Amino acid sequence: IAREPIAIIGMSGRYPKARSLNEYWENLKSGKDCITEIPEERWSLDGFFEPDPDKAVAEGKSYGKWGGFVDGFADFDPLFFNMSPWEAMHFDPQERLFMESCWEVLEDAGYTRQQLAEKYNRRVGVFGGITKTGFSLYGPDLWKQGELIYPHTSFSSLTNRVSYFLNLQGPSMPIDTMCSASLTAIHEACEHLYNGDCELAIAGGVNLYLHPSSYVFLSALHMLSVDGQCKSFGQGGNGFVPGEGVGTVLLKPLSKAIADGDHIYGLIRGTSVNHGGKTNGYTVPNPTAQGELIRQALDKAGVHAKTVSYIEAHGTGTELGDPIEISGLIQAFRKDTQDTGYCAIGSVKSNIGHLEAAAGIAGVAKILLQMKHQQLVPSLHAKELNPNIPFSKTPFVVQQDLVEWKRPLMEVNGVLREFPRIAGISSFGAGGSNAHVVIEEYIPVSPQNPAIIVLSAKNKERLIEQVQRLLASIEKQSFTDVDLVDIAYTLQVGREAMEERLALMVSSLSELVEKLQSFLAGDDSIADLYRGQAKRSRETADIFAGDEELQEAIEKWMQRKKFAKLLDFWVKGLNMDWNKLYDDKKPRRISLPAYPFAREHYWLPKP
Amino acid sequence: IAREPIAIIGMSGRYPKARSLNEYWENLKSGKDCITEIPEERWSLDGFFEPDPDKAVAEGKSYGKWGGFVDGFADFDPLFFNMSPWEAMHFDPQERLFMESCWEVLEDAGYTRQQLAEKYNRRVGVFGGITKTGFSLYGPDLWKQGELIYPHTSFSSLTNRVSYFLNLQGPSMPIDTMCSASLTAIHEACEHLYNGDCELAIAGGVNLYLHPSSYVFLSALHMLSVDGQCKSFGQGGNGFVPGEGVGTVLLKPLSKAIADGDHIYGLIRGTSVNHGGKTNGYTVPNPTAQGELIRQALDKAGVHAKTVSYIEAHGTGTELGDPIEISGLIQAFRKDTQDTGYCAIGSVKSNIGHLEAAAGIAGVAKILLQMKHQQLVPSLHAKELNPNIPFSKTPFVVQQDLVEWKRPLMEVNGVLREFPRIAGISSFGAGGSNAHVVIEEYIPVSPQNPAIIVLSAKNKERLIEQVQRLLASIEKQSFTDVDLVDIAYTLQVGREAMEERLALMVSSLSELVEKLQSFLAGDDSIADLYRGQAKRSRETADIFAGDEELQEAIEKWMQRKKFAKLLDFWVKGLNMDWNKLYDDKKPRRISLPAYPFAREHYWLPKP
């Protein structure tokens, strides 16, 4: 029997040359090649790089010097997370990026820690894909010099730190199935929702290259392309090029997501995992296993293969792997249809490289953005196709250009019928752990009644950045006055009230823009704008909170639109339940910029 | 609604001073303290050990020099696993131990890879607890000397290698929730059985200390006892002492285990996991979380707390942790009963130390052995109890001596009723990931018709060891002629036929003993005993296998008891289906010694 879909109600991500999901989409749309040489900051090429692959292996060197790298890999805001600068240095940057990403995904969804505790009794799971080690390798040389620095990678801490800080009591565990880690995390997250182990789940992954030995080892296994490219299904695919990233999604069963008014990116209709079993080699993929995997996900989802219109392939660009992936796909698909050339296929690995543990979540992000903008983006390095793959005899055509993503038409029974946009994504671990996920698009003020816009951050600098980023988002998302109430509501209930506070009473979006610009310009005496720190009136604020009579008065202030007094108190530290503003019709939560973390650089000292 | 229990149909384990489960039990029964100083083989104490704890931390040293260590930690039989000696050296010994343990657990259960493929379509999951890194830290010094040796710890490979070699296609993933890893693995294994992700599951864990930095780090966190003991619930508990181990269980739903005639160690009636959420410190356990965890497992199991008669506690022996564990337990228990002093409590950590990832499976092994022998063993270092814990006001009494384990009596409704032996086990990760499992005991030849005893190994040396170990087991398990048919059947269908073969036709157990002893003595011309290699008649054997007419003839040989010809051919490489021996009544599978792997030492070279 079929199960209800899992809604994706929040997403965060940083990928190569894409500090934000908006930049990620722009890069994907334009077919941007995000591969570069290793940054000197990570390590030097001298003594590391040897272009002759066989000589490189003989001399313990790497014949690859290319990768898709994330900017600010060592950036962190430890004060924000109640951590010391010294503590941060001990933390694997991968775990740091994931910490921020998990905070971001709650904010994207429009959730606070308080709401998760009150409404969901903290029943939130955290499933984090991770596989790379190497941070710890810097230890021994530091210890020889007497430094009391113990760099360590704790997979368990990847998720436990998040559960601790966000105050979550659902299952908290890392997923390491190598290259399929983050897609396996999504599978496990969904299954744990289905069996009631939690009511919400964070799923995702992270992948960074921190020590040069990672490249030396991949070279020793001849897994690297000498051309530094993932030529997904293209001629001359000869290995992969490594890549970095971090991403998460927030998951909740569809019926409840609709009931709670969440914004929905898409639906997970089915997921599957398996293992290849005994093949001709430990790292040799199994096309029969892959086909059964895909078929099971389709079956669980209730999806007919003729109605799948995009596949995000594993697609690492290997001579052996790429043709095997297509064999697996057609094995699954052909049980439903013999039709050919109707489904687009691609791989983001052609753009940003092989993100290993984070490859799945990166691919999911691509699918969701393709769904949002209803476009299919190019897949790179395959103008000439792998000649060993007979695509014309399969469902699949490698997407070469940016095009409209059209809803497909299938005959139910002599009647044409439009189907929604459905995509599949595969992720295959080198060790043989496989995962597949089937995703479907989601098809759903005045001076007399002004909006209350609130913003808050840990300090003035962060607050200013918040204002800048909100202004940019308003322009980028092409908001109008119709969106104002949603913006207000999201910032009200979807953001944690912090120390440095700002509040506005506005009648129009244009009004909001103007006052924020005046704020940034240094203008003061701005009409109906309030600034303050929560430390100013803390003793009084605490008295207000605990007191029945004083809370009633605040409620009356809200009922009678005494916003001047109300907003003045809020910026001074008085905490409110902004839901009290709304009698019956509650606005919707939408995506707005997450907290702009301090970008403080924390990386181990030279030995 | 309640779910049917998960049967434990196989178990393997190596623990400190216990190469076998039989030795493990003897140690537990006698209250043996298995803690020793660090073996010189692992690392030297010079430059490592400093008894002043605060001085040790200041100087990057360890104030602990004690542990529960497994013998043969670096032993492996790579040829057996189709691996090279060079390959083995690259493999983390933890992964090696787990590989052998997984092979052993199939054999204990009486399963072959072939049977798993034919009867269960390879739908077998592998869930392996692991958390320790350090093997890789030896890399940098080796690379400076130009060695092309890349020691690496791949959590994913822990399970993927097993899935590959054993040819399994169920979920294959490591579990790292720190100290609760292997108990979490059991939870995940059971849940994956319930949701149909597989039909059988291997669950367990492994834990080894391979690099001294592990102790230096535990010292830096002041987690080590200066007395090198886990004083579980005892006066002066002041930290833990580390410990090593590897263990696995094979799991299958009870109804099917009964149907297939498996031997059952016990029943998993309920399991639970959660996370502590926000506590006063990252490593500070949450008694309320623990109580809800335990209560959920009890609820899932349908177990009333008055009927639980033993708890295997996490019990690490810390000033803060031990009293919190009891608070959590009584919170769960008191929802069912206010009764006191009826349930025994203990921790194997008092015997073998804190096995971290493998602590859970070690505790499970203890519970099952206690159930098998219907005895409760001592818990050490608690003659004087922790004075901060008011045990007399709780259900619990620390087990001080070896005693009969009595089935408890509870009043259902004015009527006395005997209940089966039910135990709970807790495992708490330092990062806050918790697990609890509720386990219940399982309450179920002639010269004219001789038994066919078969043994086989990779070579003569291994075969000889097999014979020795079988003889020892016959004496140890106090078998009689009644057990002969089970022994025969288990060795027939529960063992993979290997290259070096031995077969006997016997009428009595005494006959079996005598002929095996003669074999070992070098006697030849032994009546009704056959020796051979499968390479001898390989070409002919292959012809026999593929041929319909020849197989019919073999079947007739079996039907007409032409064992002389039959056994002569089998030892020469002819493969048979021994089930053909049995018309209606099939004997039961029982526990017999697993394959005696070559003990070849593989450890990295000195830098």
Q: What is the DSSP string of A269-335?
A: EEEEEEE--S-SSTT---HHHHHHHHHHHHHHHT--GGG--EEE------TTHHHHHHHHHHHHHTT
Q: Distance between the two ends of chain A, CA-based, in angstroms?
A: 59
What is the distance between the alpha carbons of residues A448 and B2, in angstroms, rounded to a whole number? 57
Q: Domain coordinates of chain B in residue numbers?
A: 1-485+585-607, 486-584
What is the distance between the alpha carbons of residues B20 and B13, in angstroms, rounded to a whole number? 6
Query: Do A204 and A249 form a contact (C-beta atoms < 8 A)?
Result: yes
Q: How far is CA B303 from CA A554, B274, B311, B326, in A?
A: 49, 19, 13, 19
- Inter-chain contact A60–B143, Cβ cutoff 8 Å? yes
Q: How far is CA A396 from CA A325, A359, A393, A421, in A?
A: 12, 21, 8, 16
What is the distance between the alpha carbons of residues A92 and A135, in angstroms, rounded to a whole number? 6
Query: Do A437 and A183 form a contact (C-beta atoms < 8 A)?
Result: yes
Report which secondary-structure segment, H or E, holds B551.
helix B548-559
Q: Identify which of A167, A177, A277 has the shortest CB distance to residue B169.
A: A277
Chain B residues whose CB is inside 8 A of the A126 CB are 275
Q: Is B533 exposed, middle or buried (0-12, 13-18, 19+ CB in 10 A)?
A: middle
- Inter-chain contact B164–A282, Cβ cutoff 8 Å? yes
Breaks (C-N over 2.5 A) in chain A follow: 444
Nearest residue to A172 (alpha-carbon basis) of A151, A136, A200, A144: A200
H-type alpha helices, A80-154: 85-90, 93-109, 113-120, 139-144
DSSP structural state of residue B481? G
CA distance A192 to chain B (A): 9
- Inter-chain contact A277–B146, Cβ cutoff 8 Å? no
What is the distance between the alpha carbons of residues B507 and B603, in angstroms, rounded to a whole number? 47
**Structure tokens of A230?**
């993932």
Q: How far is CA B353 from CA A545, B76, B221, B248, B573, in A?
A: 49, 24, 17, 18, 47
Residue pairs spanning A and B at CB distance below 8 A: 198
What is the distance between the alpha carbons of residues A50 and A44, in angstroms, rounded to a whole number? 12
Angle between the N-to-C axes of helices B548-559 and B538-546, in degrees from 0 to 180, rounded to the nearest 10: 100
How many residues can be counted in chain B?
A: 607
Q: What is the largest CA-CA distance in chain A?
A: 80
What is the distance between the alpha carbons of residues A330 and A335, in angstroms, rounded to a whole number? 8
CA neighbours closer than 13 Å in the CB half-sphere of residue A366: 33
> What's the distance, CA A470 to chain centroid?
20
Chain B residues whose CB is inside 8 A of the A160 CB are 177-178, 275, 282, 429, 431-433
Report phi then psi at B275, rounded to 5. -130, 150
Amino acid identity at B558: M
- Inter-chain contact A276–B169, Cβ cutoff 8 Å? yes
Spell A228-252 as b/e; 16+ CB within 10 A means b: bbbbbbbeebebbbbbbbbbbbbbb
Which of the residues B274, B282, B604 would you substitute to probe the A interface, choosing the one with the greatest number of A C-beta atoms within 10 Å? B274
CA distance B54 to chain A (A): 13
Tokens 């052993």 sit on residue: B104
Report which secondary-structure segment, H or E, holds A403.
strand A403-404
What is the distance between the alpha carbons of residues B426 and B434, in angstroms, rounded to a whole number? 8
Which resolution, in Å, applies to this structure? 2.0
Q: How far is CA B523 from CA B471, B496, B518, B526, B529, in A?
A: 17, 26, 5, 7, 11
- Inter-chain contact B168–A274, Cβ cutoff 8 Å? no
* Dihedral over alpha carbons A510, A512, A513, A516 (to 10 degrees): 160
Determination technique used: X-ray
Query: Do A103 and A149 form a contact (C-beta atoms < 8 A)?
Result: no
Q: Is A540 exposed, middle or buried (0-12, 13-18, 19+ CB in 10 A)?
A: middle
Nearest residue to B207 (alpha-carbon basis) of B237, B247, B166: B247
CATH architecture of B486-584: Orthogonal Bundle (1.10)
Q: Identify which of B57, B122, B274 has the shortest CB distance to residue A169.
A: B274
Nearest residue to B98 (alpha-carbon basis) of B207, B246, B249: B246
What is the CB neighbour count within 10 angstroms for residue B523?
11
DSSP structural state of residue B61? -
Spell B473-485 as b/e; 16+ CB within 10 A means b: bbeeeebebebbb
Angle, CA of B172, B175 and B176, to the nearest 5°? 150
**Structure tokens of A571?**
């910026």
Q: Distance between the two ends of chain B, CA-based, in angstroms?
A: 59
**Structure tokens of B71?**
């013998």
Query: Do A204 and A355 form a contact (C-beta atoms < 8 A)?
Result: no
CA distance B256 to chain A (A): 22
How many residues can be counted in chain A?
A: 607
CA distance A597 to chain B (A): 21
What is the distance between the alpha carbons of residues A197 and A170, in angstroms, rounded to a whole number? 7
Nearest residue to A265 (alpha-carbon basis) of A602, A600, A599, A589: A589
Q: Is A524 exposed, middle or buried (0-12, 13-18, 19+ CB in 10 A)?
A: exposed
Chain A residues whose CB is inside 8 A of the B146 CB are 60
Query: Do A300 and A3 form a contact (C-beta atoms < 8 A)?
Result: yes
Q: Identify which of B122, B157, B433 has the shortest CB distance to residue A173.
A: B433
**Structure tokens of A184?**
């396996």
Where residue B46 falls (left for φ over 0; alpha for ψ -120 to 50; beta otherwise) is beta
What is the CB neighbour count within 10 angstroms for residue A4?
12
Superfamily of domain B1-485+585-607: Thiolase/Chalcone synthase (3.40.47.10)
Angle, CA of A201, A205 and A208, to the nearest 5°? 160
What is the distance between the alpha carbons of residues A319 and A314, in angstroms, rounded to a whole number? 13
What is the distance between the alpha carbons of residues B503 and B485, in angstroms, rounded to a whole number? 15
Breaks (C-N over 2.5 A) in chain B follow: 444
Q: Which residues pair with B274 in a beta bridge?
A: B434
Query: Do B6 and B254 form a contact (C-beta atoms < 8 A)?
Result: yes
Amino acid identity at A171: P
Name the E strands within A429-492. 433-440, 451-457
What is the distance between the alpha carbons of residues A225 and A563, in angstroms, rounded to a whole number? 62
Q: What is the largest CA-CA distance in chain B?
A: 80
Chain A residues whose CB is inside 8 A of the B143 CB are 60, 213, 216
What is the distance between the alpha carbons of residues B498 and B515, in angstroms, rounded to a whole number? 21
- Inter-chain contact A137–B139, Cβ cutoff 8 Å? yes
Find all residues with CB under 8 Å of B469, minimum gap 6, and list them. B593, B596
Angle between the N-to-C axes of helices B359-373 and B21-29, in degrees from 0 to 180, rounded to the nearest 10: 80
Chain B residues whose CB is inside 8 A of the A133 CB are 133, 136, 152-153
- Inter-chain contact B171–A275, Cβ cutoff 8 Å? yes
Amino acid identity at A284: V
- Inter-chain contact B275–A170, Cβ cutoff 8 Å? yes
